[PDB]
Ligand binder design. Sequence first.
Ligand SMILES: Oc1cccc(Cl)c1
Ligand SMILES: Oc1cccc(Cl)c1
Ligand code: SF4
Ligand code: SF4
Ligand code: SF4
Ligand code: SF4
Lengths: 443, 419
Amino acid sequence: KEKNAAEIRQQFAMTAGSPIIVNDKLERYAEVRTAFTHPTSFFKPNYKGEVKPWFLSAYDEKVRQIENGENGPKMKAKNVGEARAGRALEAAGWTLDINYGNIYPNRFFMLWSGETMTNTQLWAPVGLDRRPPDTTDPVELTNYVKFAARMAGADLVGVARLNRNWVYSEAVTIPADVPYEQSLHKEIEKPIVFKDVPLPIETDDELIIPNTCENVIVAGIAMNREMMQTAPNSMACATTAFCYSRMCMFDMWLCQFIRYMGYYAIPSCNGVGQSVAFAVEAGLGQASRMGACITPEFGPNVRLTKVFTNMPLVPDKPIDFGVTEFCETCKKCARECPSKAITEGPRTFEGRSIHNQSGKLQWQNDYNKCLGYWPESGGYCGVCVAVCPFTKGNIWIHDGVEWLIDNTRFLNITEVWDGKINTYGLDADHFRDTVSFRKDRVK
Amino acid sequence: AAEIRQQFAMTAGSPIIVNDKLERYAEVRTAFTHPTSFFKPNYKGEVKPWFLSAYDEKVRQIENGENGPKMKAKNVGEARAGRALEAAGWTLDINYGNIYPNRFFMLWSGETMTNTQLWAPVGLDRRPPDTTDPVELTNYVKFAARMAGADLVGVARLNRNWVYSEAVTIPADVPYEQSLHKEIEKPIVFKDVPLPIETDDELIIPNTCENVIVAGIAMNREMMQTAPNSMACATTAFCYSRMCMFDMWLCQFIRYMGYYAIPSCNGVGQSVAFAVEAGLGQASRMGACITPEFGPNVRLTKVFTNMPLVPDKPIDFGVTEFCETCKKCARECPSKAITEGPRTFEGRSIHNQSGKLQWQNDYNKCLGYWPESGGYCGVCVAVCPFTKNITEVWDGKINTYGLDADHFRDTVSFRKDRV
Ligand SMILES: Oc1cccc(Cl)c1
Ligand SMILES: Oc1cccc(Cl)c1
Ligand code: SF4
Ligand code: SF4
Ligand code: SF4
Ligand code: SF4
């Protein structure tokens, strides 16, 4: 029986309700607490023992590997030119991303209003962003916005009501008068608040999201399997990087579509809130031991971005295809993790360190240990994603009655450069899995 | 598809036939820019820049619940959604085509880009190349081109006949808000200099700029078949933003490999000629490059570089002989812009470059239909055999970037077909 991704999603659909289990110690999480930004984790030694911002120490390791003809830690390249080429591809992939994630809200690409954008100015005579909505029916709007999402580069798209528990209490950002070249030295915190205002607006003191901001649209941006399977080496860094620029394009495209439909839209990429939780509530997939959203189509080998809006929409149903029970017995990511960051224990409500948000039931991982491996390896690792059985393209089988996971699944870089590739790194052997008709956009 | 393209490869040599009269063509002569064609009436009889008159028709259509000229939408909501999708598609494109060289997204150096600055401590853009072998470089850069969103990619030596003699641009310190009102003409010249450079007087391409890399960016078939209505405008628009990201991504890769790279999108030179010389397809009666995978339903962009590369062979799969007897685009064109006659070396008007054997079309007649219809037409692309209602499009099949899984296998690539 030929694989039917739509059938699979329908088979495992849940009844409505946020799947994330929480208790009374839950409070919104200040973004500065992530390992990338917090002072306790931001600094890492380089290979000479010099203590630096982690990404500068990682740069030192990239340079060292190129000079030594390596594609990764102790991984010899074919020659220096191949080592150089992998890092050139990685660096280029980030072209449309600011400071590794686009996290500053309402700066650079992540503007909360389209008014100053060159595209908005060019189109101003038509008045699409000033004319009241011609469609308020959530059913039709869901079909329109999901169609637009696929045009804008999403491989998966889902809708959820906005759960404010996953919106950061304070964002990391920069003052509005700070030019890019000083941005990394002038980062500040700024509260994200919800108020009775008509439009998203930023004051000197606050980023203000309107109380009318009902919905979040979550996109999955598929990474390339062959390149991620080289983790922790450079080609895994390149598929990561290119997908961050795809995320940025998605956010801007979709926000402009929503604005030109007469609503407002807030982009975010890696900023504003916790993408994994939104993705789980929007039904893209389930949380996992490693901490990523695992999808039926791509496993965890998929990036996430999201857009917040007042556009009326129909929320999607969460999905339960057994990930929690497989993660309970699998632990491959924990065993293979080069830094032992991933727990082999049970889920708890108690954060392992400052980097975890306490009060939600999850596997609690040590993300300072994870980040510490990045300067050592000169990359963004990804070994957990690479070894997860759900990342394999071969997991789904049909037994004549229904779909199921094949339990047998759970028991070099020159060839990548010389091997299979297609547009955006997508794989035509599986691309049919993300075909979409109206019936699977809105019910 | 790899079998087909090898089967139809020609021996080396530009297939475009030229004569002694050929001269490089000033970009201002295109119908989009030239003063004789730029102003068009709207439906009220008011003469405006053609795209503003076209805007007025889009507004009139939304108000009247239409997706195109005399084409009722399901309701006003559907009409609005089609124009919202079209407008959004252009997000990463400046003034319909990114033609101003070394402005906005089309910078000729990576030095000021936020990504280059972030990566500066690694020194990839200042380190000499570690690879000079054109075979390996061709494989690397084509792999990168596919990562960067090209559905097709080819390489040719740069033929300066197709580089505009003078570009349309704006002064470097003019802000976006005044760009449309302060467009100027600036020569593109070739000189013995190390790097692409712009002076007050000239855009200077180095004599070492040996090669052009041409990308095909596939449009969506269902949407283009709604031409001249709004969903054909939307697939057009989204692919212009795909073009811009391709140029920037690939230029950065080439720079981080130790070479220089000039992006262009619709600027700098004539994409159809470059695409034919790079083997993506053949010229056609309508004037487009027709590819085996997509026919003419594919957009083009290109990047110029001194990176050593292996030129691809031109391809001949019989387009010329088919266009000789077909004439379907010419009979369906709503403005009679496309000739039914034979190819000549003599342009029909200022908008054509004389001195090259081609079907000569009247591109002022084409542009005149755009304000009338409120869109970018595309009927010629839609009806062409090589290419093979709006509610059904919105309710129907779609996939990532509008690509089609029924055909996506045709653009799979291994090293054997890259070099
Ligand atoms: O969020 C990410 C992911 C990978 C690399 C970096 Cl630097 C940031
Ligand atoms: O080059 C193009 C193509 C379509 C529309 C416009 Cl305005 C320009
Ligand atoms: S490797 Fe195993 S335990 Fe880890 S996330 Fe994947 S399925 Fe779960
Ligand atoms: S990215 Fe690497 S170091 Fe981090 S959790 Fe995954 S396997 Fe461990
Ligand atoms: S775009 Fe339309 S008007 Fe222009 S040549 Fe093609 S069919 Fe004719
Ligand atoms: S419609 Fe016919 S004559 Fe026109 S470009 Fe296509 S094949 Fe050629």
